[PDB]
Design an enzyme around this catalytic site. Structure first.
Site, PDB file in Angstrom:
ATOM      1  N   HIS D 186       0.819  -1.220   0.000  1.00  0.00           N
ATOM      2  CA  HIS D 186       0.000   0.000   0.000  1.00  0.00           C
ATOM      3  C   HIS D 186       0.854   1.272   0.000  1.00  0.00           C
ATOM      4  CE1 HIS D 186      -3.475  -2.554   1.217  1.00  0.00           C
ATOM      5  NE2 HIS D 186      -2.652  -3.057   2.118  1.00  0.00           N
ATOM      6  N   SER D 316      23.898  18.040 -15.681  1.00  0.00           N
ATOM      7  CA  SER D 316      24.439  19.346 -15.329  1.00  0.00           C
ATOM      8  C   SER D 316      25.458  19.208 -14.205  1.00  0.00           C
ATOM      9  CB  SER D 316      23.323  20.303 -14.899  1.00  0.00           C
ATOM     10  OG  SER D 316      22.293  20.370 -15.870  1.00  0.00           O
ATOM     11  N   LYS D 322      21.486  14.037 -10.024  1.00  0.00           N
ATOM     12  CA  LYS D 322      20.253  14.019 -10.804  1.00  0.00           C
ATOM     13  C   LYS D 322      20.422  13.042 -11.959  1.00  0.00           C
ATOM     14  CE  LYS D 322      16.509  16.324 -12.795  1.00  0.00           C
ATOM     15  NZ  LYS D 322      15.160  16.632 -12.195  1.00  0.00           N
ATOM     16  N   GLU D 329      11.048   5.356 -18.557  1.00  0.00           N
ATOM     17  CA  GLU D 329       9.990   6.075 -19.254  1.00  0.00           C
ATOM     18  C   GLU D 329       9.744   5.490 -20.639  1.00  0.00           C
ATOM     19  OE1 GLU D 329      11.300  10.087 -19.057  1.00  0.00           O
ATOM     20  OE2 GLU D 329      11.169  10.134 -16.867  1.00  0.00           O
TER      21      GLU D 329
HETATM   22  O1  LIG Z   1      14.667  16.670 -18.532  1.00  0.00           O
HETATM   23  C1  LIG Z   1      15.764  17.276 -18.562  1.00  0.00           C
HETATM   24  O2  LIG Z   1      16.577  17.260 -19.512  1.00  0.00           O
HETATM   25  C2  LIG Z   1      16.150  18.106 -17.349  1.00  0.00           C
HETATM   26  C3  LIG Z   1      15.536  18.226 -16.171  1.00  0.00           C
HETATM   27  C4  LIG Z   1      14.260  17.559 -15.717  1.00  0.00           C
HETATM   28  O3  LIG Z   1      13.205  17.984 -16.227  1.00  0.00           O
HETATM   29  O4  LIG Z   1      14.341  16.657 -14.865  1.00  0.00           O
HETATM   30  O1  LIG Z   2      -0.579  -5.188   4.520  1.00  0.00           O
HETATM   31  C1  LIG Z   2      -0.821  -4.359   5.423  1.00  0.00           C
HETATM   32  O2  LIG Z   2      -0.435  -3.170   5.454  1.00  0.00           O
HETATM   33  C2  LIG Z   2      -1.658  -4.788   6.606  1.00  0.00           C
HETATM   34  C3  LIG Z   2      -2.982  -4.925   6.573  1.00  0.00           C
HETATM   35  C4  LIG Z   2      -3.844  -4.680   5.347  1.00  0.00           C
HETATM   36  O3  LIG Z   2      -3.509  -5.206   4.259  1.00  0.00           O
HETATM   37  O4  LIG Z   2      -4.848  -3.955   5.527  1.00  0.00           O
END
Ligand SMILES: O=C(O)/C=C\C(=O)O
Ligand SMILES: O=C(O)/C=C\C(=O)O
Ligand SMILES: O=C(O)/C=C\C(=O)O
Ligand SMILES: O=C(O)/C=C\C(=O)O
Ligand SMILES: [Cl-]
Ligand SMILES: [Cl-]
Ligand SMILES: [Cl-]
Ligand SMILES: [Cl-]
Lengths: 461, 461, 461, 461
Positions: D186, D316, D322, D329
């Protein structure tokens, strides 16, 4: 109108006096008042199989008393015999792990089990989590119940219905094998084809889906039980999962197994996506079949009118001959529903994060619905339409005798050029090929009856 | 356990004594035992508005007596007040024109209306076809009921819930506008952003869907009534359709009109496809919102933990801090259902033939379900999650203070190279930008407080 | 085989000597060797409009010299005139933000611009990022180019093609208004309908889609430019975005605007989902129309044969009359493509995270393809089929004269029971309604041709 | 710029002098100027396999001379060696039977074959229909080419790429098995899990898709060749179909067979629907894997940062740390494309009429594209991301040490109440559960280091 007061962390909460669920189910019911789709009772029965098998397996491991195991098995058999369907009021649109329906089964099982223990004068008491959910987790139970229920639904509903419709189409294929009609490609007149041969295409469609359903349904036998919370199996005995799968197999007659990889078992639904691919393949086949039937039944005077179908709804004395193919319409609406359901399942299976995919109720809801819609659709279409498909031989014979597409059988006898004139003459002058071929002088009456045999035009030679 | 014997052309058939439908509904019920999805009561209410309006219009045209009109109106108002929901038992998976549910309404209305006439000592009698279905056809009634029911569902369920959730997000946006967090693009750290600005994106999503919903819902106001069997309007008065649309408007308060082209009205569902396009747009938006919320609320220690959401299910005293985003999961499951429903509707609208599209029940089923799932989903997510969205300022402040992405604000002061050194040093040595900028001697402690103002980094300048 | 050596921070890399892109485009091209779908040149032109407008806007803000601005505008106009299509080699399946195609445009523009400056003996030099991408970001440029390109595609391709086909169907509708055929509902014979009336349903479908397209395309005019990296507008002048939208409007003649909420503008694609809803609505309508045409043209002897369509492929002299509806098949294949494209777009729009949705190339690819497939499909179907739709009046007259569905008109004159006998008799004995009505003695030959006016049976009265 | 004058029934038409197609391909090209999607060269190679095998089979039956067979075989091998790709210019959006691409192959093969005969001083001449298309039909050739091409694409592209990515994930699973991280369900903190165990879920997803792809790809080995025009096999030798499938198997090394039911073979695509079901299952699995990777790699300071991935684009120097997950993607965009393609394929397979489904090009286009997008996507994601997945041990260790979810391991020793106190205290006072356990006096540090062993918390016991 009386109530029973239950308790949890948030306080006191009223449960209807005649209902067997507890404070968790009642608060969950109130916290998700979403939509109109109750969590399917079939998955509830899947949970009951799991809780039944878990009680026995925990008993085998010395973790549960005999009396408690007997009382849980009894309560589970109460659910599975359809006596307690009204004690499961939660919707599909709950939490994505299906935890609330898990605890709904834990509470009902515990309520009925404690009644058993008291009627048998036992000092022991069942608790929903400590006993009914022992060795289990909120996360590996719902996928187990889902696969148990989906496989059973294939076995008890979809398979018998597929076989019913298939056997009817096979019988129509054999009976109408001697009936020669005119094929159509691009909706245009084509060479002859046996009516039984055309039907044989529908029939083999159903054989193909049966072959493919046997492949894909087998992967639904793999159960998550034993992975507990994150797939590692912590808080469970190393033999628990295999034991449960064994006992569910014993009780159902289906060869369930514990999954080879519990991390996949919690995070993936590619086995259900593959199964639903089979269902969509069948849906598209059924749409094509149903469209062929209603087009062949179209008329009475402005359509094709190659077959008749049973009239199930009252018509009009002032509109004789009108039979709406209403069973075809039902089956094609079912078909497009399955295709939309396929979208949901394929999307939802992609949306997992880390150790758990929390889209399990919507996946269960859509896959189950596709199964029983195809099952009920085929059964009803079989009983109320397919068994009554009959040829209208006069209209089929007219199509054969009036067709220009037979002319190519003259080519070995008089050549391509003489046949072409006959076909063009028949087209321009509204003649049959027989009328044209005799008025050109290229073929006599006896030669035409000898050279043009539609029964020799529906097989390789 | 008593029954009433009704009759048609097929013979005598038992109707339950406490049920108000006739022989046609009972035979139709037995002939389509398919699935578990009853024809939605909302479309029955749409039919009741239609039968009500048609009684008044026919009375205006001198085609129906006053007593029959008053008795039909009364019967329709019995349906619309919710007193008769159990008298409509037919499933979605019926005839593709919805004829059977049309006659279900004709029979129930006729049954209740004749009770009215006898309770008023009238010598006149109502008949389902000759009176309740007068000037109508099997084919133009269900699309009218569908559009009436869908538009009302947008007005009474979807619009208020969208406004509820949107107003809440607008309030959180204004309250948290002064809270500066670190943006994320590609899931990578980015430049600062106001928490309120990030919420403003969710809010404007809902504003955009409201604008687009106002455009698409308007086309649902065009009703098929008046086209009768094939769209030509034969067997109906030239004013009938317009009069019916007028009275439905009077009784609902919505500005329905009779369609400008009844042939379109029977054969097309592109207006519903467009509306469902809006619903899918909203569904995708709500899934993104719900994912942002559960990611921001992830934790308590191994996630992002920028916000808290209310805890509605009981937790564990031994597991403090764990709050499962269960409302987010409900809303994302609703979202993917709507996407599958969109598949069905788009397909089904393409499959019309000649004078009628006979996929209308499944189109109604899916579109209505999409409307109320989004409505109930938004309302519940609002009440049970969104109103309780609160920042965790210690975690947000640490993200801001620890971020390397603020270094670009040093460029106008010390230059690109000087800032690059500070950013690289801070990354290598595990420092803050503040710590790195002071240990290089490039910026003083007072200069760093004056040059790096995150509240100036969230606006154009 | 000559190459030019470019460089970045990874080292030296060969660019083909005749290609104008730089090291980053060459490296991006090698890093994503995926599939066969080049990023559509239409979105490159969208980028060129953007870089052109950005140059002027930056010049207005005193951030870019006149000569640099003039050289960048020139380079952008080189791109927009179609002279440089081969300098954009990157695929759809790149980064989710479209950054690599952004820099592809930055590099080509910079390359051509420095040629301009050198050719004009200027001492300044253009740099791809510092000059061509000034005041912009990787994240707000591609959605801007996408919306620019999609809206222009609607205006230049989809709108003229929709009007062309709509005007043709309108003309057929008016010419064939006097031709009375037999309607079909559920594929069964129904009451009369004018051929033009049936065509008017196709025509109004297209009018409906035109109305809905005018609503949904308006929201594509909202551009993201000015939000920069995360929507806050940092590193951009507060007037930059509005100035860019202004100049794109000036150069294109379309009323583009800067979005009211740049956070929505980076994170949402609900406006494109809505537009694609219109495209799917049109696709489904076109499939229905195309199916009606090929069914009406089915034959020559075993189908419906109500219309002829032009023959574009050479047939056989030995198969006269066989005309395959190949344009109908093309149009329906396009239709189902658009429906699957709709799935991608709706899914991808739901998958954003925080400050950016990184599914933008696949959304662009699918939405653009749907636009030009419907455009080219409608145009070709119009030119190569629709304009040649012609009635076959002998077959249409025979359907009308042979139909039993006209018997309703006898009711006001002889009664229901007499007319029912006539219809029953005509059905059993293979008679026309006229032959049956005169052999029962119920109607005179003169009375029949006076009571049965098919031209009075296609309107309300 | 020169042209060659060809001719057909419609007159003289110019073909470019350097192109080997004939009058029919040139006329078909002009008549379907729709879209930008050329008919995939892969299905052209499938046709070449078919024409090659058909030449041999016809020679075996005495229907074709040796010299014609050798010349056709040579021309076919010219196509298969990639020497003639530019002579196939037709688009996907042609007739629904694929006839025009069939004849495109017939003409090119004929052209190249006649060049062979003249170079070998032969007086014989090849004709496109009478020779290259002998014993074949327009209708059974394209489905044969489609299955041949689709199966080969699975074998040569998808299978090797699936195994590459799977083998890499298996290797990471084994190397990172000793690394203990904190699970998430979750999106909330959960009990421990080995990093290798979490990766094993990805790996087994790919194993599962491999198992299911082996089942579904087998049905693509069934070929339609031999059914000729309507499935009856007329105008073909009873052994022709089986001989062709045999020689395609010989030349490809894949075990093709002629279909058991040619009527199914022309009218159904349920075998491709099932295969595409597997592809959508894999796509969904790959989206989940890719999302886990980019979330695990998120950061550097405001995300999860459990792993590093390789940096392929230059970053950069002022933004160190970064790294955009650009391969993730790419892979998720491919994934949603496959999901939309699945919609098209499932729809199109439902739309057949009578003796032929005429949606075959669009089905081929989408299924092939799904195969090579997944194949190229997996190969590239493997090479450019997956092989470089490395843990960031300090961040993983800190998650484990800071987690509260370990507290349950204290229950067997101190009990549930004292462990709950420790977990509550740790939560409230920002302590590790080790610091909390020692400050309460409930556990010695020697006991805590002995009672809490995360390596014992990732397996059943
Ligand atoms: O996408 C890029 O080239 C640079 C920065 C970003 O948007 O994370
Ligand atoms: O998996 C858990 O986070 C515990 C209980 C639930 O699934 O609600
Ligand atoms: O559907 C009906 O009951 C009647 C006529 C028709 O629509 O064909
Ligand atoms: O496509 C053709 O060759 C024409 C007719 C057919 O074979 O269906
Ligand atoms: Cl406001
Ligand atoms: Cl109009
Ligand atoms: Cl605003
Ligand atoms: Cl292995």
């Amino acid at each position: 109108m009386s109530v029973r007061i239950e308790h949890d962390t948030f306080g006191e909460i009223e449960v209807p006096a005649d209902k067997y669920w507890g404070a968790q189910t009642e608060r969950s019911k109130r916290n998700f008042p979403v939509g109109k789709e109750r969590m399917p009772i079939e998955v509830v029965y899947g949970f009951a199989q799991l809780k039944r098998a878990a009680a026995i397996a925990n008993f085998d491991l010395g973790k549960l008393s005999e009396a408690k195991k007997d009382a849980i098995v009894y309560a589970c058999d109460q659910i599975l015999s359809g006596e307690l369907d009204e004690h499961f009021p939660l919707v599909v649109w709950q939490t994505g792990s299906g935890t609330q329906s898990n605890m709904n089964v834990n509470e009902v099982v515990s309520y009925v089990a404690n009644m058993y223990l008291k009627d048998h004068q036992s000092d022991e008491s069942i608790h929903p989590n400590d006993d009914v959910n022992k060795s289990q987790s909120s996360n590996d139970t719902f996928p187990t119940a889902m696969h148990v229920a989906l496989y059973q639904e294939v076995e008890t509903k979809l398979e018998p219905a597929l076989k019913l419709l298939r056997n009817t189409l096979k019988e129509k294929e054999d009976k109408f094998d001697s009936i020669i009609k005119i094929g159509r490609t691009h909706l245009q007149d084509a060479t002859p084809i046996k009516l039984g041969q055309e039907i044989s295409g529908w029939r083999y469609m159903l054989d193909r889906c049966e072959t493919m359903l046997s492949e894909s349904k087998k992967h639904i036998l793999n159960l998550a039980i034993g992975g507990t919370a994150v797939g590692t199996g912590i808080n469970a005995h190393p033999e628990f999962g295999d034991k449960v799968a064994h006992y569910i197999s014993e009780n159902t007659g289906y060869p369930f197994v514990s999954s080879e990889n519990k991390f996949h078992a919690l995070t993936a639904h590619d086995e259900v996506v593959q199964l639903h691919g089979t269902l969509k393949a069948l849906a598209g086949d059924l749409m094509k079949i149903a469209n062929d039937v209603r087009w062949l039944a179209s008329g009475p005077r402005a359509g094709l009118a190659e077959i008749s179908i049973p009239e199930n709804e009252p018509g009009s004395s002032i509109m004789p001959g009108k039979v709406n193919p209403t069973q075809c319409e039902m089956l094609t609406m079912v078909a497009v529903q399955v295709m939309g359901n396929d979208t949901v399942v394929g999307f939802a299976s992609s949306q997992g994060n880390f150790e758990l995919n929390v889209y399990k109720p919507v996946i269960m809801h859509n896959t189950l619905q596709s199964i029983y819609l195809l099952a009920d659709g085929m059964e009803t279409f079989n009983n109320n339409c397919a068994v009554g498909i009959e040829p209208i031989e006069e209209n089929i014979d007219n199509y054969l005798n009036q067709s220009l597409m037979l002319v190519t059988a003259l080519n070995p006898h008089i050549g391509y050029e003489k046949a072409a004139q006959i076909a063009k003459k028949a087209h321009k002058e509204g003649l049959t090929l027989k009328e044209s071929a005799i008025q050109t002088g290229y073929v006599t009456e006896e030669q035409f009856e000898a050279w043009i045999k539609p029964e020799d035009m529906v097989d390789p030679h």
